[PDB]
Amino acid sequence: IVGGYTCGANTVPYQVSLNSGYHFCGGSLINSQWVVSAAHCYKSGIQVRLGEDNINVVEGNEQFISASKSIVHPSYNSNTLNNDIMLIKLKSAASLNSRVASISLPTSCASAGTQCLISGWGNTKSSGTSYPDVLKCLKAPILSDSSCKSAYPGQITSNMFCAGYLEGGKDSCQGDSGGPVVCSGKLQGIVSWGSGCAQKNKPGVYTKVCNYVSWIKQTIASN
Numbered sequence: 396i397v398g399g400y401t402c403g404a405n406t407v408p409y410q411v412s413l414n415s416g417y418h419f420c421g422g423s424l425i426n427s428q429w430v431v432s433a434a435h436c437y438k439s440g441i442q443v444r445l446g447e448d449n450i451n452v453v454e455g456n457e458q459f460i461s462a463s464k465s466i467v468h469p470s471y472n473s474n475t476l477n478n479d480i481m482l483i484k485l486k487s488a489a490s491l492n493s494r495v496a497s498i499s500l501p502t503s504c505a506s507a508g509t510q511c512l513i514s515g516w517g518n519t520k521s522s523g524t525s526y527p528d529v530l531k532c533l534k535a536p537i538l539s540d541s542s543c544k545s546a547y548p549g550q551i552t553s554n555m556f557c558a559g560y561l562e563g564g565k566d567s568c569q570g571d572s573g574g575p576v577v578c579s580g581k582l583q584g585i586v587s588w589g590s591g592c593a594q595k596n597k598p599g600v601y602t603k604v605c606n607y608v609s610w611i612k613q614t615i616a617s618n
């Protein structure tokens with residue numbers, strides 16, 4: 396997260412870290428046994444880490460639970476990142492508490508101009524590399540689809556939306572991948588792609604979660 400701030404410990408209690416010996420992606424807890432992330436975060440041997448603030452220090456509210464299954468969206472295309480969403484099931488139900496909490500799926504999509512919260516353990520530099528070890532936050536509005544499409548002609552689908560700031564300086568970044576965009580109490584976006592981080596006229600691109608709520612609800616009910 397570039398241009399953001401320290402959230403504070405467990406203030407984003409639906410935020411998860413995906414770990415396979417190291418943090419490699421974010422995710423969102425949507426109920427005691429299931430996580431949503433980006434399909435580009437798929438890999439085998441994932442351990443879900445809940446209740447995290449400093450990801451390099453055991454502070455006392457963590458839950459580490461191995462994934463039992465992963466389900467990438469059936470229409471995921473890795474080249475275009477269309478349908479960049481996956482579901483991960485926990486080997487055992489998480490113990491839900493104030494620091495480990497699920498985030499509601501939308502009932503309908505969010506509008507351009509709605510303010511959201513984006514969070515993650517990703518790079519904080521727009522030039523160069525620096526990884527934070529505590530969770531970083533960023534409040535960012537959803538941008539018009541046309542500004543989105545003008546930034547990335549022919550690369551935006553109906554399953555993507557842009558958020559952030561066209562002037563640059565504030566954006567998500569590598570390592571934030573699969574992490575949440577929460578607007579009005581609902582998970583509306585997943586950190587998916589962009590060009591560089593916090594560059595002028597290159598806003599962040601997010602998976603459009605409202606399009607996938609029926610798929611999510613059907614898939615968890617059958618798995």
Ligand SMILES: N=C(N)c1ccc(CNC(=O)[C@@H]2CCCN2C(=O)CNC2CCCC2)cc1
Pocket residue numbers: 435473474475476550566567568569570571572586587588589590591592593598599600
């Ligand atoms: N500036 C940002 N908001 C931002 C930029 C990049 C990321 C991380 N995501 C990525 O790097 C993703 C996953 C693997 C390939 N990838 C890409 O961005 C590759 N670029 C193409 C653009 C059209 C679809 C794929 C996360 C956030």
Ligand SMILES: [Ca+2]
Pocket residue numbers: 447448449450451452453454457
């Ligand atoms: Ca920790």
